[PDB]
Design a protein around this ligand. Sequence first.
Ligand SMILES: CC(C)C[C@H](NP(=O)(O)CNC(=O)OCc1ccccc1)C(=O)N[C@H](C(=O)O)C(C)(C)C
Ligand SMILES: [Ca+2]
Ligand SMILES: [Ca+2]
Ligand SMILES: [Ca+2]
Ligand SMILES: [Ca+2]
Ligand SMILES: [Zn+2]
Length: 316
Amino acid sequence: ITGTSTVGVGRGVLGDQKNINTTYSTYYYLQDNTRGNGIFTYDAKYRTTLPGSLWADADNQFFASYDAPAVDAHYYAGVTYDYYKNVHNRLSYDGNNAAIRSSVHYSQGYNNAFWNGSQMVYGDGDGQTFIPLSGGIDVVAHELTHAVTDYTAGLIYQNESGAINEAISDIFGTLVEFYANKNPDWEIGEDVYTPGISGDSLRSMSDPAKYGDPDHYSKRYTGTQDNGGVHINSGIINKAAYLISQGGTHYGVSVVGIGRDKLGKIFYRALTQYLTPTSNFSQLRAAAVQSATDLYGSTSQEVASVKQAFDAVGVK
Ligand SMILES: CC(C)C[C@H](NP(=O)(O)CNC(=O)OCc1ccccc1)C(=O)N[C@H](C(=O)O)C(C)(C)C
Ligand SMILES: [Ca+2]
Ligand SMILES: [Ca+2]
Ligand SMILES: [Ca+2]
Ligand SMILES: [Ca+2]
Ligand SMILES: [Zn+2]
């Protein structure tokens, strides 16, 4: 909408106070004009029609329980925008400052979040499996990264390309979480998963097997569930990424870590310059090696470590 840029204040899903960029025109809307062509947050009102209504508030204060998922969807979209712009010189998901749209309060007791081809969508959770999913910065960044992937490599959402797609979203979800630097880790969704159980998460990049996901190509899933295991086989690539960044010895193969920033540069370049819609794991290895070669040189430690990491997870 047309209006003037304002700054509201509210509380997120975890009870933390934050400022948010709003727009005033009769109401205060969750419309942040400070980033690209805007970040817009909508109320789906427990229904499934999208996007719903642009979030309107009378007083620019967002402290109601009902407000919390909107505050976080809006704020964490801003953090994710900032990560891509400041770290990778990418302007929004399409590289041309496309408006970023999110809807919260999607459906009833909805234990998921997704990119629907055009916007981000967040359930509230059922209160047991999940609390409102926009409370997780890694979740918000995971979702926006699906848009980045779709506009770039275009990895088809099934089988190995789909597992790469998923891992890309977990990798950048995590790198955004580290960028914001509040309780960062290499787990996925820990801030919103199972409020009654401490110390768990949906997936682990550092040890995928802790939640039953494969950490080696010989353990890949080849059945039909989950689009051919896109959230399962992502563990193989997540583990490779974790090893590239942090190092370790895995099934007897030692990897020299090169740190998060270089992991991000290598994978961002692979995603945007080398991967294609049908890339498989072997082709991802080749894309990562080439990306590291471009950035650091063929004789570099960075190239050597990429090779070691893919060796460790059984991908040649
Ligand atoms: C980070 C996490 C909190 C949320 C994450 N959602 P997504 O974006 O990968 C789900 N997207 C999806 O299924 O794409 C289908 C589609 C395709 C095209 C248009 C619209 C929809 C996830 O990991 N979900 C898991 C699962 O769905 O298996 C879950 C529930 C954690 C077990
Ligand atoms: Ca209010
Ligand atoms: Ca965390
Ligand atoms: Ca995390
Ligand atoms: Ca938990
Ligand atoms: Zn995903």
